[PDB]
Design an enzyme around this catalytic site. Sequence first.
Site, mmCIF file in Angstrom:
data_model
loop_
_atom_site.group_PDB
_atom_site.id
_atom_site.type_symbol
_atom_site.label_atom_id
_atom_site.label_comp_id
_atom_site.label_asym_id
_atom_site.label_seq_id
_atom_site.Cartn_x
_atom_site.Cartn_y
_atom_site.Cartn_z
ATOM 1 N N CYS A 26 9.752 1.860 6.804
ATOM 2 C CA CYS A 26 8.431 1.380 7.263
ATOM 3 C C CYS A 26 9.034 0.654 8.601
ATOM 4 O O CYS A 26 9.041 0.896 9.534
ATOM 5 C CB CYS A 26 9.028 -0.019 6.898
ATOM 6 N N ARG A 27 9.524 -0.008 8.881
ATOM 7 C CA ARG A 27 9.794 -1.217 10.692
ATOM 8 C C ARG A 27 11.291 -0.869 10.485
ATOM 9 O O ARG A 27 12.113 -1.538 10.210
ATOM 10 C CB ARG A 27 9.685 -2.516 10.594
ATOM 11 N N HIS B 47 9.130 8.782 14.612
ATOM 12 C CA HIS B 47 7.282 7.376 14.504
ATOM 13 C C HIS B 47 6.386 8.657 13.731
ATOM 14 O O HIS B 47 5.293 8.436 14.346
ATOM 15 C CB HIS B 47 7.031 6.770 15.873
ATOM 16 N N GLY C 71 5.165 9.219 11.304
ATOM 17 C CA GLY C 71 4.275 8.438 9.431
ATOM 18 C C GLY C 71 2.889 8.785 9.256
ATOM 19 O O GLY C 71 2.330 8.783 8.847
ATOM 20 N N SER C 72 2.341 8.407 10.598
ATOM 21 C CA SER C 72 0.507 8.920 10.708
ATOM 22 C C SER C 72 0.578 10.171 11.217
ATOM 23 O O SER C 72 -0.974 10.407 11.762
ATOM 24 C CB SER C 72 0.113 7.753 11.543
ATOM 25 N N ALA D 122 0.812 -1.381 -0.067
ATOM 26 C CA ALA D 122 -0.105 -0.009 0.333
ATOM 27 C C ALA D 122 0.665 1.229 -0.153
ATOM 28 O O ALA D 122 0.913 2.151 -0.482
ATOM 29 C CB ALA D 122 -0.725 0.181 0.845
ATOM 30 N N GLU E 114 12.780 0.756 19.222
ATOM 31 C CA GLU E 114 11.362 0.171 19.640
ATOM 32 C C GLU E 114 11.180 -0.733 18.823
ATOM 33 O O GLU E 114 9.872 -1.399 19.696
ATOM 34 C CB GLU E 114 10.566 1.681 19.146
HETATM 35 N N1 LIG Z 1 6.055 5.034 9.435
HETATM 36 C C1 LIG Z 1 4.611 4.623 9.838
HETATM 37 O O1 LIG Z 1 3.939 5.346 10.913
HETATM 38 C C2 LIG Z 1 4.253 3.758 9.121
HETATM 39 C C3 LIG Z 1 2.883 3.770 8.835
HETATM 40 C C4 LIG Z 1 2.577 2.520 8.008
HETATM 41 C C5 LIG Z 1 3.010 1.387 8.155
HETATM 42 N N2 LIG Z 1 4.337 1.037 8.292
HETATM 43 C C6 LIG Z 1 5.170 -0.562 7.842
HETATM 44 O O2 LIG Z 1 4.662 -0.947 8.033
HETATM 45 C C7 LIG Z 1 4.016 -1.722 7.095
HETATM 46 C C8 LIG Z 1 2.892 -1.423 6.502
HETATM 47 O O3 LIG Z 1 3.529 -1.276 4.661
HETATM 48 P P1 LIG Z 1 2.377 -1.699 4.130
HETATM 49 O O4 LIG Z 1 2.459 -1.038 2.587
HETATM 50 O O5 LIG Z 1 0.759 -1.143 4.647
HETATM 51 O O6 LIG Z 1 1.828 -2.979 4.110
HETATM 52 P P2 LIG Z 1 1.536 -3.955 2.713
HETATM 53 O O7 LIG Z 1 1.068 -3.624 1.386
HETATM 54 O O8 LIG Z 1 1.296 -5.251 3.851
HETATM 55 O O9 LIG Z 1 3.255 -4.507 2.604
HETATM 56 C C9 LIG Z 1 3.844 -4.984 1.655
HETATM 57 C C10 LIG Z 1 4.388 -6.082 1.400
HETATM 58 O O10 LIG Z 1 5.775 -5.859 1.319
HETATM 59 C C11 LIG Z 1 5.745 -7.268 0.902
HETATM 60 N N3 LIG Z 1 6.937 -8.370 0.847
HETATM 61 C C12 LIG Z 1 6.757 -8.752 1.840
HETATM 62 C C13 LIG Z 1 8.036 -9.564 2.387
HETATM 63 C C14 LIG Z 1 8.810 -10.042 1.322
HETATM 64 N N4 LIG Z 1 10.088 -10.840 2.038
HETATM 65 N N5 LIG Z 1 8.710 -9.483 0.485
HETATM 66 C C15 LIG Z 1 7.830 -8.576 0.324
HETATM 67 O O11 LIG Z 1 8.093 -8.559 -1.177
HETATM 68 C C16 LIG Z 1 4.772 -7.947 -0.448
HETATM 69 O O12 LIG Z 1 4.882 -7.743 -1.136
HETATM 70 C C17 LIG Z 1 3.760 -6.281 -0.395
HETATM 71 O O13 LIG Z 1 4.270 -5.648 -1.151
HETATM 72 C C18 LIG Z 1 5.706 -1.166 5.691
HETATM 73 O O14 LIG Z 1 5.195 -0.915 4.725
HETATM 74 C C19 LIG Z 1 5.865 -0.125 6.303
HETATM 75 O O15 LIG Z 1 4.984 1.270 5.812
HETATM 76 C C20 LIG Z 1 5.101 2.170 9.110
#
Ligand SMILES: NC(=O)c1ccc[n+]([C@H]2O[C@@H](COP(=O)(O)OP(=O)(O)OC[C@@H]3O[C@H](n4ccc(N)nc4=O)[C@H](O)[C@@H]3O)[C@@H](O)[C@H]2O)c1
Lengths: 329, 329
Positions: free
Chosen positions: B235-236, B292, B294-295, B154, B265
Amino acid sequence: KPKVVLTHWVHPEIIELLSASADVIPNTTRETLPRSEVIARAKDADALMAFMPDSIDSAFLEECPKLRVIGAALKGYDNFDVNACTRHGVWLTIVPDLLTIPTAELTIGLLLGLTRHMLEGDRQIRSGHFQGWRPTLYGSGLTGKTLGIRGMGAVGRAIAQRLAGFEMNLLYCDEIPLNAEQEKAWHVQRVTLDELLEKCDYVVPMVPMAAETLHLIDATALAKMKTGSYLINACRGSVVDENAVIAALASGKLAGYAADVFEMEEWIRADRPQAIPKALLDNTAQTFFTPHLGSAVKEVRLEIERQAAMNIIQALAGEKPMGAINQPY
Amino acid sequence: KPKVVLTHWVHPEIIELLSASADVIPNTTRETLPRSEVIARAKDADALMAFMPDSIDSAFLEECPKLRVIGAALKGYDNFDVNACTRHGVWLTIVPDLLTIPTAELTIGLLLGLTRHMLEGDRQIRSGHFQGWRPTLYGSGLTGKTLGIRGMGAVGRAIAQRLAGFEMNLLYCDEIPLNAEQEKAWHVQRVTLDELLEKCDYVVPMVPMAAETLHLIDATALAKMKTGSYLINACRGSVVDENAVIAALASGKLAGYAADVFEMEEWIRADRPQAIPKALLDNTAQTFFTPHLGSAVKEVRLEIERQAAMNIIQALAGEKPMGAINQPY
Ligand SMILES: NC(=O)c1ccc[n+]([C@H]2O[C@@H](COP(=O)(O)OP(=O)(O)OC[C@@H]3O[C@H](n4ccc(N)nc4=O)[C@H](O)[C@@H]3O)[C@@H](O)[C@H]2O)c1
C-alpha cells in the site's frame, strides 16, 4: 463500396446516412445476434458498428481480417481489447457521454412510480373492478420528505437540479462538494454518509465513474438507514447488493426497491450471477423495475447512432475518426 | 492549436493519439524532470498529463495560466489541490481501476519471493557454485498457514480471490465487512486487527493514507505479532514504521519484510526521510524490495495513459472528461 455490419437496430435515417458510401448489413430485429452470427456477417466487413452486448477480443478480430474500423455506439470501451484492435490495424472509436439527463429523469420516474403504487394501481384499472375513489394505495409523498444522493457527478447533479422544485430536504454526500452557488440554487446540503443513511426516507446511489467502490450499499448500509425507507437504483449494477436488499424488504426495513440496473448485467466482475433474483421479481408490491431503459429516449439514441456512423464514414474515407481512442497499425 | 505537456514517458501510440487535436510536448526520457523544467514547459500549455511524481498546487497553476485540464495517470491524488484547480478553471481527472490487479499480483510475488528465499537463491546461482541440491534456504510454505489482510478494498479483494486456491487460512480486518457470499467464495474470515496481528504468519496491510493508522504497523503493532511472522507492504509507504521494522528483524520477531513502497517517497508529511533506511537496504537475507512497481505491467500502463489522454482530448473538445473529479467554469 465498403461494407459495414451493424450488430443492433438503428433508426433508418442512420442506415441511409451510411448507405451513401458503404454497403450496409442491418440487424432488422430488436434482438442481439449470437456471436456466431455477428462474426459471420462481419467475416468480410470493412467496418462494424458495435453496442453494449458486443465483445471484441483478438479471437474476434482474427476471424475478421477485412476490418478497418469498429464504431462503438458506447461512451466507454470496457468490453473491447483496445490494443488488439490496434495490433490488427483496426480503428476503435467511441461517442461522447449523452446519458446523463435521460437517466436522471428515469430515476425520478422510478421514484414516483414506486412510492405512489402506480403499477398496482394500473393493474387494478386493467381488471374491471374500478368503481371510483377508495381508501387504498395510500403511498408516500416527496414534499417535506428527505432524500439523499450518495454521489454527486453529472447525473447526481442532474437529479438535484430537477428535484429542486419538490419542496424536499435534499441531502448529498461526496468527497468533493458542489459550488456554493449550486447549493443555494438547489437548496441541497452536504453531509457525511452516516448522516445521509440515518436520516433519509429515499436513498439514491448515483456516483460518477471516477469514484468507484463495488457493493457501495450492503446490509451494513441497510441497517444504518431509516426504517421503511426507499432505495432507487439506476446507477450501475455493482453499486447495490441485491441479496441484502431482499433482506431489508422482508424485515420491513425497506418498504420499496426500484431499479433500472442489476449486478447480473456485468461480466467483468467474477462474482456475477446471470439471472435477476426471483425474490425481487415476485415482490410486485415493494418493487418497480425497467430493463436498463436509462438512456432509452429517441433523440439521445439517434444522436449516439449518428456519431458512431460519422466515426465509421470518417475512418473509411481514410481520415482519423473524430472519436478515436487508439492509433492502429 | 492547443498544447499538451506530458511530465513522464508515455507509449508512442498515446503521443500519436494526442497529436490529432493538440501539439504534444513529451518527456522523451525515462526520468523525472525537476519541478522547474516541468513548469517551464507547461507555462503556455492547455493541458498536462501528470504522473505520481508531480505535485500540483496553487503556485504551479499560477505559473501555468492557459491550463484547462490536468489528466492524472493515477488513482490516488493526494498530491493535487482539487480546490485550487477548480478555482483556476482546471479539470482534474483520474484513472479509477487499472491498478488494482497488477498490484495484487506483485504483492503475491513479493510474498513468495520473501518466504522462499528466492533472491538469495538467485545470488547463490549467479555466483556459479551451484553443484546440486543442498540442505539450505529452507523457507516457509503457503499451504496450511494463516495470512491476514488489513484493508479489504479493491486490492485486498483481488489478493483474496487469487489466494483462495492456495489452501490457506485467510483473515481480514476492515471497517466495512465483506458480504456473505464473498466471505464464502474466498473463505475469508472477518476479525479484529488484534486477532489478525495475533494469529497471522503473514500480514499484508492494504489500507489508504490516513491521519492516524499512519504508521499502523508500528512497534506496538509488531509487539503482538507471532514470532517469525512476515509482513508484505504494498500500500502506501507510510502505513509501516520502517524503523520499528528494523528492530523487529534483528530481535527475531519478524523473519522478513517485503515492500514495494517506502516512507521516503511521501512528501505530504514533514516527517519525511530522504533515503531508505540502509539497515533494511543491507539485510539482503530478510527483505525483498521493488521500486514502486505495483502497476509496472506494460499493457496496463498503456491503458492508464490511454485513459488520461482521453480525458484531455475530451476536455479540450468541450465535453466533460469521463474521469473528472472536478467541475470548473
Ligand atoms: N504499490 C502500488 O503501486 C499501489 C497501487 C494501487 C494502490 N496502492 C495503494 O493505494 C491504496 C489503494 O488500495 P485500494 O484497495 O484500491 O483502495 P480502497 O478500496 O479504497 O481501500 C481499502 C479500504 O481500507 C479501508 N480502511 C480505511 C481506513 C481505515 N481506518 N480502515 C480501513 O479499513 C476501507 O474499508 C477500504 O476497504 C492501498 O490499498 C494500496 O493498494 C498502491
